[PDB]
Amino acid sequence: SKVPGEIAELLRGFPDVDVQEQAFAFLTVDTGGYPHSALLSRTELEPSTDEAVLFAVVASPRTRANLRRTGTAGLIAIDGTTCHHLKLRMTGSLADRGLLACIFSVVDHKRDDLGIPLQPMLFRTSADLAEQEDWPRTRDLFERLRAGYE
Amino acid sequence: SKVPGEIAELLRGFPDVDVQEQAFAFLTVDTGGYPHSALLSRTELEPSTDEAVLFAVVASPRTRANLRRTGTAGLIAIDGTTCHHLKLRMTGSLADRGLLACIFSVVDHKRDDLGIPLQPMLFRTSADLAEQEDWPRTRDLFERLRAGYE
Ligand SMILES: Cc1cc2nc3c(=O)[nH]c(=O)nc-3n(C[C@H](O)[C@H](O)[C@H](O)COP(=O)(O)O)c2cc1C
Ligand SMILES: Cc1cc2nc3c(=O)[nH]c(=O)nc-3n(C[C@H](O)[C@H](O)[C@H](O)COP(=O)(O)O)c2cc1C
Numbered sequence: 498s499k500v501p502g503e504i505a506e507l508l509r510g511f512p513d514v515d516v517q518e519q520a521f522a523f524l525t526v527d528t529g530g531y532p533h534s535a536l537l538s539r540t541e542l543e544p545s546t547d548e549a550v551l552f553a554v555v556a557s558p559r560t561r562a563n564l565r566r567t568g569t570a571g572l573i574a575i576d577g578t579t580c581h582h583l584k585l586r587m588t589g590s591l592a593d594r595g596l597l598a599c600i601f602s603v604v605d606h607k608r609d610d611l612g613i614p615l616q617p618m619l620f621r622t623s624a625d626l627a628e629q630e631d632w633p634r635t636r637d638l639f640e641r642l643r644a645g646y647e
Numbered sequence: 648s649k650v651p652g653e654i655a656e657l658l659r660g661f662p663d664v665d666v667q668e669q670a671f672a673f674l675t676v677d678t679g680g681y682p683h684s685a686l687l688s689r690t691e692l693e694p695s696t697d698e699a700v701l702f703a704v705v706a707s708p709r710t711r712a713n714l715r716r717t718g719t720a721g722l723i724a725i726d727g728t729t730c731h732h733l734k735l736r737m738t739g740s741l742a743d744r745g746l747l748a749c750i751f752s753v754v755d756h757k758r759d760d761l762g763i764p765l766q767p768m769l770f771r772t773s774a775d776l777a778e779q780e781d782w783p784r785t786r787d788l789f790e791r792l793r794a795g796y797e
């Protein structure tokens with residue numbers, strides 16, 4: 498399958514600082530079988546150029562361990578009247594200090610739409626966040642991912 | 648443990664129609680071990696009066712089955728600068744047609760706060776939604792839950 502078109506458009510590209518962005522719930526499963534979440538943004542989510550796969554860069558330690566243990570993940574993405582629910586299977590990964598760069602195949606996509614306009618989770622980017630989430634290293638890892646995938 | 652105070656305040660009460668409300672990501676795990684999500688609101692989430700436990704009413708079929716299979720769940724709740732991540736263990740349930748009324752113990756709470764103001768997922772209630780999610784039956788089930796818990 499592929500990254501759904503509307504989701505590729507929601508995630509593609511990287512924000513500058515001081516800009517309103519959607520926070521995407523990035524889901525995993527912990528060792529007791531409980532669902533687990535982290536917030537990611539366009540900075541840590543990028544489709545491949547052909548949209549076949551979804552790349553992610555994850556800093557949060559428990560999410561990273563969950564991915565290493567089960568290889569399963571999911572995403573919530575909000576766009577207009579649609580809540581997109583994704584399920585993701587990790588097919589490869591690359592570690593760089595506290596960051597895990599991941600390649601995901603989409604294994605399921607549900608368009609959850611009741612005809613009711615939705616607002617996404619939102620936050621404003623900042624120079625502090627750029628430091629907390631190590632944007633320079635995330636960017637580098639995404640280019641390493643792009644290069645290896647191709 | 649108990650329902651965290653800030654989360655009890657976010658969930659308590661029931662909205663009328665045509666009102667802006669937060670949509671809470673309600674998480675489960677499916678049969679292949681993938682995280683799974685549904686959107687719920689204050690209409691389908693209510694703390695016990697003593698805040699010891701969290702009641703929920705779930706209509707979405709796969710979420711309901713996931714709960715029946717694993718008894719695990721989670722929640723995302725947004726409040727100011729804090730993203731609240733909850734993990735939930737189902738301790739009892741009651742079925743009424745297509746609805747599953749659930750009692751959850753909180754097994755974990757993480758306050759995820761980077762000092763960056765957050766906007767929750769939002770939607771406006773409506774008479775159609777009241778019908779789609781069967782508010783009269785949800786309300787009844789919550790009173791049945793309150794009664795049995797006490
Ligand atoms: C606005 C905001 C942005 C965040 N961005 C990221 C991010 O890009 N990468 C990340 O790993 N965690 C990020 N987080 C933090 C995760 O949501 C948080 O660490 C979560 O509890 C997951 O941590 P854990 O997997 O170690 O439990 C962000 C949090 C907020 C509030
Ligand atoms: C605005 C909005 C409100 C919703 N409210 C509810 C709800 O109260 N209860 C519910 O079970 N599903 C609700 N949903 C639908 C779930 O998010 C959706 O069915 C999801 O795909 C879970 O279905 P599944 O568990 O069968 O896969 C809502 C969807 C939207 C867009």
Ligand code: NA
Binds near residue numbers: 509540541
């Ligand atoms: Na991106």
Ligand code: NA
Binds near residue numbers: 659690692693694
């Ligand atoms: Na409520």
